[PDB]
Amino acid sequence: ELIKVPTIPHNLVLIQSDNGKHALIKEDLGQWPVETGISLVNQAGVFAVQLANKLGIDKPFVLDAGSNYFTDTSFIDTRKYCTDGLSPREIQKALNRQRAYYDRPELTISENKTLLSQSIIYPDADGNDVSIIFSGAMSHAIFTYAQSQWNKNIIKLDDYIREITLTVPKQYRPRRFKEIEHTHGYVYRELNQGSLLPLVDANLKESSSYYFKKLMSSISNVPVDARTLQSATAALAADTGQAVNRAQHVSMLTNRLTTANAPTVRAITVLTCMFKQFRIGMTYALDPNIMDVAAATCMLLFRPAQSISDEQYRYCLQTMAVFLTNTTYDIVNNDTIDVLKMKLRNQGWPFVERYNAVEIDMSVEPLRSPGQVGRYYNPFNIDPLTKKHVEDRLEEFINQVQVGRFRNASGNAVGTTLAAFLRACRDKTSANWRGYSVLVSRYRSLIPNELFESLRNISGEYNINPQDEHSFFFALAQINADDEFIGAIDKESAEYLDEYATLARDISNSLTLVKAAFGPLERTSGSIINHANNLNKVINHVFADKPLISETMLKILTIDGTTGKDGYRNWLDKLVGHNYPVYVEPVVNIMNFISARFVADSSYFGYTNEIMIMPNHINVPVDDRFGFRDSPFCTSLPRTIMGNDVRRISYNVFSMMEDIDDVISEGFILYDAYFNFSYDIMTTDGVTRLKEDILIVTDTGNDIKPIHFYIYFENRNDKKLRYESKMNVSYRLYIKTPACLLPLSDYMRAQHDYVSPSSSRVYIKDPAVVYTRS
Amino acid sequence: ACRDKTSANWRGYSVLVSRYRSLIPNELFESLRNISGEYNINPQDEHSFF
Amino acid sequence: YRPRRFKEIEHTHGYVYRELNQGSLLPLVDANLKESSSYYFKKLMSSISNV
Amino acid sequence: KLFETSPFDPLTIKNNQDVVDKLYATQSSSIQEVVPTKTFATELQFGVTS
């Protein structure tokens, strides 16, 4: 939400003597205490944040000072006189008093009209309003720079709609816009996308666990329509020969069909078909039975090949060979894939191959993936074009299993049972692939491409029991999409969008902090000590008051089990010396500009870098423009005085000294330090002297006391004041003239221009281009 | 779990070793370079430590 | 680093006693410390406060 | 202090075996390489007596 600033933040103050002979204009930005021995850029930034807060510049804003104007009584003058800045009436009064001192006549009518019309608002070619007012240099520069930096992100509504037109899904309803919002609509949106890959790469399993848990909590509640388990069991029992008097293998298959954990397996299937690489494995019993063979066949046939790993494939083949080929686990421990396949095929079993799923491209662009096309695997290894399984000989393979002989030379019990089970599972998958495909597509629309290609399941938390797999494929349910489910999904889509944006912002802030704070590490001790101490200080500072990091990031770092501070500390340590690109946001540029101007123009903020101390009996060139009596300001520090160079001493050497009397008998220039000072310009005439003494001598060292000048104006013919200045004061301190001080005579240099955008612009708070279906 | 814990808490143990080395004088350290020994640690103690 | 100045009287008429024997740690160090090393190790770990 | 607990008091001992016994009593304080426990024997013979 842009903030419309109604008034220009000038800081001009007019100071005039009681006589009125002298007058001056000053910029008030305040005094900021600057330390020595520490880096200056860091303090400059710390002060720049507060300076931006003072000027109403830090937060995004636009200028709305166009309407602050009036019109003159005279009918010729149609000019719009602006009311902001230093009012020309004040300068008129000061100039009138100054001319009243010198017995000059007051300002004439023509001169009054010339002066009172200096501040004016006029239209610009494109509709903006330019206001020319009296203002300081620093405020003008900082305000204009901030205006430009924030204007870099304001774009027309049509351009934004064009930028985000690729990602709008087909089903949702377009949003009508008022014609004004089309002709004059403007939106403030940041359009740079922060990569989430640093966090995902640094701590992969935490992010994977968090996203998988959220996705499965969402998926588990999808309504389904399922055939009764008892009905399917009756159908299978009739298909084979099932009797209650005699033990059989079909009874073993149909004695542990459980639908209790169906939603979990459904969510696992959606996750497998959604991501690029999501591994799942099953642990079979120590003594394999027909359930294990059924589950292994189901995994190989209907789970995607990418989901099954090579070790899982070998384990499944080993279990199948143990059951169907008169062998033990110790026989096939050293056996490879090819030997297992040949052994199983020699006995007549053809289901020894993995099958690659077929990708389908999403209709619209994946979120947070500019200029990219997303894809997802079709469930159950069914080709969308052919509407059947990828393996085109599946019926022939089932017939082969039916006619084959496994575990018994005579009798087709195992073959018939397995063939019936596989045929039932194939029919269920062929009937129900569509709804699972739709659900996989929709839930794939929620994750970006970085998460699609990066997230992996390494904790092994989401496995499927063999009983659950065979039950899930035998009694497959038909996924039903209700309106409530779609509404909940839309709400979660909004939640995921917000959380991704917050994660990106947190990552960018952390990258900036780790680049600014911690340097390179070395094999030497003491370097490790310094790094540990700096890490502790950084963690303690960032976590105090309002935490720098968002709550969702703390959650994803904590999900491992850490305290929240420990996880962030580890992540920050892992990011030291990165090469990840970062984006310079407008606020960073504004702070850098203000800090650079703080470092350069030191006089505006109440600190200088060199001072001079010399006795009163040595004459000194001084800045006599203002009219101060015994002015402590010099236009520039004298390079040579009385034909000899002025001695320069560093603050450290000066403090270390022990013969300060001899060196002070001549006077010297102190440097290599940041001298903070202040002054109080008093309107009357009086002796100009410091609040405290210049110097303090201790047996430990010598220091310079705080500097506070009491500046008084000058009347030349005053023997009392002249004698007091000549005799009472024995030593004087000189600093370079502050740049905020400016004479009244050259007031035209305070004229400055500010541009405000057209008032016809209408701002859209919600730039969404589409409506929810219901 | 062991790898994560060790990667999280290695700076502190390195600093502790540095301090302990800083405690010892030079002559005593040179004397202690002549001796030698072997420490037997129970598996349970090691797995609990890590 | 340079030392702080004393009183003026202590400078003009001040006298101090001192000894210049730094000494050596060899008599303590020179021995077969195989048996006595572990007690020193325990004392060393007790020197630094932990937990 | 070189030792938190002295390995032995020099004035108390009178022969070598006194030193051996004192170390076994004070070995609990020392950081032991191998902690003492029940001993395991592998050879044991009895000679005929009077």
Automatic annotation (TrEMBL), chain A:
Coiled-coil ranges from the UniProt annotation: none
Name of the featured protein: Vp2
Organism: Banna virus (BAV)
Automatic annotation (TrEMBL), chain B:
Protein name: Vp2
Covered range of the whole protein: 605 to 654 of 955
Species, as recorded: Banna virus (BAV)
Lineage: superkingdom: Viruses
Species lineage: Viruses, Riboviria, Orthornavirae, Duplornaviricota, Resentoviricetes
Coiled-coil features, chain-numbered ranges: none
